[PDB]
Amino acid sequence: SHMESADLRALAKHLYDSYIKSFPLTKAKARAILTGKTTDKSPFVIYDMNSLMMGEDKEVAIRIFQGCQFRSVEAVQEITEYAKSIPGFVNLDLNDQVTLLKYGVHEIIYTMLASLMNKDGVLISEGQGFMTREFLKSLRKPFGDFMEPKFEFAVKFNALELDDSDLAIFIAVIILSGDRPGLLNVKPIEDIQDNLLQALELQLKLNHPESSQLFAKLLQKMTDLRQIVTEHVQLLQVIKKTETDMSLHPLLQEIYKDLY
Numbered sequence: 001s002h003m004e005s006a007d008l009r010a011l012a013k014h015l016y017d018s019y020i021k022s023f024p025l026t027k028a029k030a031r032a033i034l035t036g037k038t039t040d041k042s043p044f045v046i047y048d049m050n051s052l053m054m055g056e057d058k059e060v061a062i063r064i065f066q067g068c069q070f071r072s073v074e075a076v077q078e079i080t081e082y083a084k085s086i087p088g089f090v091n092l093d094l095n096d097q098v099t100l101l102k103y104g105v106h107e108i109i110y111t112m113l114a115s116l117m118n119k120d121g122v123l124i125s126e127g128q129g130f131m132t133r134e135f136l137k138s139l140r141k142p143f144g145d146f147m148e149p150k151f152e153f154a155v156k157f158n159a160l161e162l163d164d165s166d167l168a169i170f171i172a173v174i175i176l177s178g179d180r181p182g183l184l185n186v187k188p189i190e191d192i193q194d195n196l197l198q199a200l201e202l203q204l205k206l207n208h209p210e211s212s213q214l215f216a217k218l219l220q221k222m223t224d225l226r227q228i229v230t231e232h233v234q235l236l237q238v239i240k241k242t243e244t245d246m247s248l249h250p251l252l253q254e255i256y257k258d259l260y
């Protein structure tokens, strides 16, 4: 209810530490890759079909779609370990830990995706590649239209100009949302988020002290995320059943066997 400001500072730096350990490609590292001047640091830019074939690390848009699906699985493992480091998380009912992560990973993936994006494209692989926004938008339906809304949210979110020490607490606040459906013990979850919200508010005042009501803007983006993500998972499920389930395309299988 009323943590001391020193306690909130320690909580913030503990979260920053585990954030650095779980997520190797921080926003700071991604920004430096995006502005490097050498070819050694340079990510290979994929801007059309020929450039994509040269990058070594619908066959194409489905491979791209399944490529990001795999990266989200790796992100979940990293988010789960970071969530285990939030003080008091592992003391909750094991099913509430699952519920909180179940609804939370999709919102965190959207947020951390902004860390890899600018107005022109997105860092992919582990910073070794860069896919342009217009290439991904050009992908045949429904892939082109499924990926563009991520860019549209990122340029808004990145305008808030948050760093890793900010995102560490923001991600934790998302995870400890007491109003997820199906939660058993709500009060202990809210008691943790009350402390994280205090720690978040203090961090956004020490950082960005000229920035007016950044705490409020960030909270509004957070609830915006939930509606955005509900639509994202629903269309993602549609795409996974009508486009990547080869058992539903028996004639494409015959083509593949007859041509390859």
Ligand SMILES: O=C(O)c1ccc(-c2nn(C(=O)c3c(Cl)cccc3C(F)(F)F)c3ccccc23)cc1
Pocket (backbone or CB within 6 Å): 064, 065, 066, 068, 069, 071, 072, 109, 110, 113, 122, 123, 124, 125, 126, 136, 146, 147, 148, 150, 151
């Ligand atoms: O970690 C990575 O290398 C990485 C990781 C993710 C992307 C990327 N995913 N994505 C999706 O829409 C997406 C897809 Cl297509 C399938 C499953 C899940 C997602 C999700 F991340 F949104 F949740 C994008 C859209 C626009 C731009 C970049 C990306 C890109 C790179």
